[PDB]
Amino acid sequence: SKRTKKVGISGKYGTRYGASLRKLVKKQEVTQHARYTCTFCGKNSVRRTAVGIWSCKSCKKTMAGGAYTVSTPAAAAMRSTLRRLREITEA
Amino acid sequence: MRAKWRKKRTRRLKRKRRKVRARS
Amino acid sequence: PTRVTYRRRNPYNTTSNRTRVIKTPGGQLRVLHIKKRGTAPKCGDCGIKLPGIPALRPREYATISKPKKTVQRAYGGSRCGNCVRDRIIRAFLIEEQKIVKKVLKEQSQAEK
Amino acid sequence: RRQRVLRRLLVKYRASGKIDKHLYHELYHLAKGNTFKHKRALVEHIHR
Amino acid sequence: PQEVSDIKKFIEICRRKDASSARIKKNPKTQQIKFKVRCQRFLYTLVLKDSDKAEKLKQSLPPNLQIKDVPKRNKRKSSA
Amino acid sequence: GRVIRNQRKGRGSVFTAHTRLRKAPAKFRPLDYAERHGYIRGIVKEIIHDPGRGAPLARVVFRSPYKYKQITETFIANEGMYTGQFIYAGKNAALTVGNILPLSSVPEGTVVSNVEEKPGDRGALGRTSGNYVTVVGHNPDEGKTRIKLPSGAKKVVPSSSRGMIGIVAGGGRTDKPLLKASRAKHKFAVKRNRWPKTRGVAMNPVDHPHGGGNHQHIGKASTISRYAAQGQKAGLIAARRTGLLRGTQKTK
RNA sequence: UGGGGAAAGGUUCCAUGUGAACAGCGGUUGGACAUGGGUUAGUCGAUCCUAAGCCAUAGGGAAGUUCCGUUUCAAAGGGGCACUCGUGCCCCGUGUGGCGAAAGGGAAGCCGGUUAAUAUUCCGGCACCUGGAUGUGGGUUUUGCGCGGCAACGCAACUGAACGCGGAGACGACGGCGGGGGCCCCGGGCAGAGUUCUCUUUUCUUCUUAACGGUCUAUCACCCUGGAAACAGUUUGUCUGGAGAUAGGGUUUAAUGGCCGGAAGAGCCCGACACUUCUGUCGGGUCCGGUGCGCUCUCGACGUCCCUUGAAAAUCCGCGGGAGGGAAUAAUUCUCACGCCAGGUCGUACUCAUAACCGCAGCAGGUCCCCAAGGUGAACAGCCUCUGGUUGAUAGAACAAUGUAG
RNA sequence: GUGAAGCCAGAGGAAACUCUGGUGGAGGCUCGCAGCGGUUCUGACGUGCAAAUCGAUCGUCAAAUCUGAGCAUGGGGGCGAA
Ligand SMILES: [Mg+2]
Ligand SMILES: [Mg+2]
Ligand SMILES: [Mg+2]
Ligand SMILES: [Mg+2]
Ligand SMILES: [Mg+2]
Ligand SMILES: [Mg+2]
Ligand SMILES: [Mg+2]
Ligand SMILES: [Mg+2]
Ligand SMILES: [Mg+2]
Ligand SMILES: [Mg+2]
Ligand SMILES: [Mg+2]
Ligand SMILES: [Mg+2]
Ligand SMILES: [Mg+2]
Ligand SMILES: [Mg+2]
Ligand SMILES: [Mg+2]
Ligand SMILES: [Mg+2]
Ligand SMILES: [Mg+2]
Ligand SMILES: [Mg+2]
Ligand SMILES: [Mg+2]
Ligand SMILES: [Mg+2]
Ligand SMILES: [Mg+2]
Ligand SMILES: [Mg+2]
Ligand SMILES: [Mg+2]
Ligand SMILES: [Mg+2]
Ligand SMILES: [Mg+2]
Ligand SMILES: [Mg+2]
Ligand SMILES: [Mg+2]
Ligand SMILES: [Mg+2]
Ligand SMILES: [Mg+2]
Ligand SMILES: [Mg+2]
Ligand SMILES: [Mg+2]
Ligand SMILES: [Mg+2]
Ligand SMILES: [Mg+2]
Ligand SMILES: [Mg+2]
Ligand SMILES: [Mg+2]
Ligand SMILES: [Mg+2]
Ligand SMILES: [Mg+2]
Ligand SMILES: [Mg+2]
Ligand SMILES: [Mg+2]
Ligand SMILES: [Mg+2]
Ligand SMILES: [Mg+2]
Ligand SMILES: [Mg+2]
Ligand SMILES: [Mg+2]
Ligand SMILES: [Mg+2]
Ligand SMILES: [Mg+2]
Ligand SMILES: [Mg+2]
Ligand SMILES: [Mg+2]
Ligand SMILES: [Mg+2]
Ligand SMILES: [Zn+2]
Ligand SMILES: [Zn+2]
């Protein structure tokens, strides 16, 4: 009762656009429809509305993030480095 | 209380006072 | 099984030609034209519909008595009341912290 | 049709008192799964 | 048109400057009596199940305004 | 021949920009005394998406220092901003993500966005989804700052310019292929009409310099000089080199 | 091939009469000819507001007819009071034009009848909106501007200047589910009609209740008590819960739901009696249930898709703030009930198509919408039927070749 | 008509994980009416119904589908999936 061998979510495209393109689109699509835990209220209800907007269904807060993920490794490393630099320099 | 109804209400009082002025 | 016809000059179904089918005491099926449906006002902060306030078109609110358009408390309209409770609590605690913050400065920083 | 008939039976038993909530929740999820074919098979399962 | 709940307010309604006329309608099948008075804006109606109070009210009300008895098969001015 | 396609776009009749669904442009506040000497604060009300663009916009509410009123503006939201935040603007503002402070008051190594080329033009540099600029060094005397642009270029800007801390939201928008004709057609359609693309070799001699022929070919060098007559710049314009980029790029 | 509209046509609409011409044959008939008649609005539209866009003003070009420019290097405005009398003062100031939708936004009318030709307009009955004027009833006040409920909130009223905040107007496509109106279907009863060699407690038709009000209810949501793991509640579709579930008790948005007025006095169906006409008259009836993946419209809670997130303005309401004004014998700036007057201008006939529009024409062509019965059947497939509408396209006799179609 | 993610129940294994039955209703998917288009018969007519029509057979049919009104671009100029 798996209905698929390896194609997964990107089975709606049938036999078009090529295997490599379907694999590339599937890898990035899978992370866009999932659900993520809210950082403020803690409940597991946060979903994507627009290209860079994610909102929680419980506390109704909305946050601006990446295109297909709440946060980016570059932005996380930049926030962490900026916090470290500020606290060492001014304290 | 929109201005049109307030305007009518004060004009109505203005005439009530003029009538009192002519009554005295 | 009689069929019906419009009674006005507009022949198109353009979200302003709202109709209902009625049967008349004369034994005929005609059409009666209706206006649009009013929307209930929402809260200023949270955005939910206030209870106890009717939903009418924006012009009909000028013919209704005042007590039917509000609720007897502070911020009667446009605020649900949970937001009012939040405002009261926030205002009191913020002013209390401002008092303690201001009192601390003269002794701990101006003793010299 | 089958889901409403089964759920109506389960709520009737819970309200009357023939079964308790611990058995109710388990029977609810077994009814959600394709386990019970019909009304007689379900009532037999409660009796057993 | 709006019901008047009790007997008490009918006489004040009938003793007004704009009470143009009034009429009496009787329903034999349902054993019912209807009292109607016509003002400028509304048509007040009173419903009575019993018959005894009808005549007493009829003579108690002021004689100034006219009262009709609504003949059957009401017809227009032109001949039937 | 007739006028070629790329000359008609300058008349601005059919090739204009669609702007019905855009509410306001994105700019900073005007430079004022309060932000030159101290700081002011504002609330973040909403995070909205406007058509034809990435980098979702943010709605911020400030007070009025001179009158009993409030002024609304529209900024570009950096990744990590959320509704209800207090944001600060001025010379003495703290150094956190989302704050607006003059570019002089920043230690080396910080990334900013929506930087003004000159103080008061309300943002010129680095305002696209996932891009930023980095400070390189300061010149305390004869105030000036060296910066590095997203393209790799280096620049010198006056020390009184402004910038807002963080990285423009939107992440890696251009990684997945559009994969479908519709999605691209919508993207260009919402901005300006350009989605139909016509190859110059398939054209007619009256229409395009590449013209016709019994075989589909150009017939002449595709590199066009820097100073050429209007209607001739159709091809590789002022090319310094040509071909696949094998080695490293000398330009920096 | 029915009943009505937008664009377009302009009397083609109705009555009476008729020699010639037209209707590719005839004609007593006609969308033809001649003589007369016919289109009534505070509630239906235009009138109001803005959209893409167009044109004045401040300015700059061009020998010039004129081109650019729409808030731009402009000294660009409006609110109140008292004086016999306009002519005297006192405040605010960032901004300051017009045109542009009979399918966008929008204050208000329903039923029955009536003419040869018009009616949501005319007549009868019963209502509503806006603008403008005034008096009674009731309410509040000597504690000067209301009471009740812990709460969600309630009631026939129940002060609010400058300025400011908010809501409604105000919005995508698709998928299944639930409530309501109309249509369709089945059973019983009262009337009338069709068939009958034989059968059929048989087949068919009518059995209706408007706008506008009163009263009792109907998803979501919210409030109070109490504190959950042997975890619980629960949708067709797994969401919800110590950021407070189950359970018990309440408040509220939403009638196209039940009853009462309007309203049986209406409309409809039978019977019986006069009888030139003018005219009629008198008797009865106008009910009770069921069913559903049924068709159509509407409302509500969910779900999916986007590098596509799906108008603006006029107009209307509540609040924060506290300017001014006002009684103890009456005063009253009470959004409550009743009561007085008025609501200007233009379109309204008819067709909307195998004859009323465009194609040289009474042309097998082209041209934007609303309503949508029974049977077979998966079905707006094909075929037969009911309401309604036609029987109009030059005809008569015979059946060779060659043809067009089957 | 076919049946993508998500969800429920059962079975196997030391584990990592693997099987079975339902639920669900995605796709510039598919058969096929109205609409839109116009491949073949090189059919009919070809001083025709018609200065481009008629019949049978065909392509697509929930999306780059079809369409009304208002506005903009004017001749060496416009517009053009060419
Ligand atoms: Mg105001
Ligand atoms: Mg690549
Ligand atoms: Mg190409
Ligand atoms: Mg070619
Ligand atoms: Mg050339
Ligand atoms: Mg060349
Ligand atoms: Mg080639
Ligand atoms: Mg007709
Ligand atoms: Mg005439
Ligand atoms: Mg003839
Ligand atoms: Mg003749
Ligand atoms: Mg004749
Ligand atoms: Mg004769
Ligand atoms: Mg005649
Ligand atoms: Mg005629
Ligand atoms: Mg004539
Ligand atoms: Mg109107
Ligand atoms: Mg105007
Ligand atoms: Mg001009
Ligand atoms: Mg000039
Ligand atoms: Mg206008
Ligand atoms: Mg309209
Ligand atoms: Mg007419
Ligand atoms: Mg009238
Ligand atoms: Mg107030
Ligand atoms: Mg709209
Ligand atoms: Mg339904
Ligand atoms: Mg009724
Ligand atoms: Mg409960
Ligand atoms: Mg009744
Ligand atoms: Mg009767
Ligand atoms: Mg429909
Ligand atoms: Mg009048
Ligand atoms: Mg028609
Ligand atoms: Mg024709
Ligand atoms: Mg013609
Ligand atoms: Mg069947
Ligand atoms: Mg059929
Ligand atoms: Mg006909
Ligand atoms: Mg013929
Ligand atoms: Mg013949
Ligand atoms: Mg022969
Ligand atoms: Mg043959
Ligand atoms: Mg397809
Ligand atoms: Mg065709
Ligand atoms: Mg053909
Ligand atoms: Mg041929
Ligand atoms: Mg021939
Ligand atoms: Zn949250
Ligand atoms: Zn609230």
Layout of secondary structure:
The structure is cut from a larger assembly and holds chains A (91 residues), B (24 residues), C (112 residues), D (48 residues), E (80 residues) and F (252 residues).
Chain A: H1 19-29, E1 46-50, E2 53-56, E3 62-64, H2 73-90
Chain E: H1 8-14, E1 21-27, E2 32-38, E3 43-48, H2 52-60, E4 66-68
Chain F: H1 5-8, H2 33-37, E1 39-48, E2 57-62, E3 71-76, E4 86-90, E5 100-102, E6 111-113, E7 133-139, E8 144-148, E9 154-157, E10 162-165, H3 181-191, E11 223-224, E12 236-237
Parallel strand pairs in F: 11-12
Antiparallel strand pairs in F: 1-2, 1-4, 2-3, 5-10, 6-7, 6-10, 7-8, 8-9
Bound molecules: magnesium ion (48 copies) and zinc ion (2 copies).
The structure holds two RNA strands.
User: How many distinct beta strands of chain A?
Assistant: 3
Termini gap of chain C: 100 Å
User: Which structural class best describes the helix and strand composition of chain C?
Assistant: alpha+beta
Q: Give the % helix of chain A.
A: 25-40%
Rg result of chain A: 18 Å
Q: Strands of the biggest beta sheet of chain C: in what spatial order?
A: 1-2
Count of DSSP H/I helices of chain A: 2
How much of the sequence lies in strands of chain C comes to 5-15%
Q: Ions, cofactors, ligands: which are bound?
A: magnesium ion, zinc ion
Give the spatial strand order of the biggest sheet of chain A: 1-2-3
Main sheet specs of chain C: 2 strands, antiparallel
Sheet having the most strands of chain A? 3 strands, antiparallel
PDB class: chaperone
Keywords: RAC, ribosome-associated complex, thermophilic eukaryotic ribosome, 80S, chaperone
Entry title: Cryo-EM structure of the ribosome-associated RAC complex on the 80S ribosome - RAC-1 conformation
Chain A: 60S ribosomal protein L43-like protein
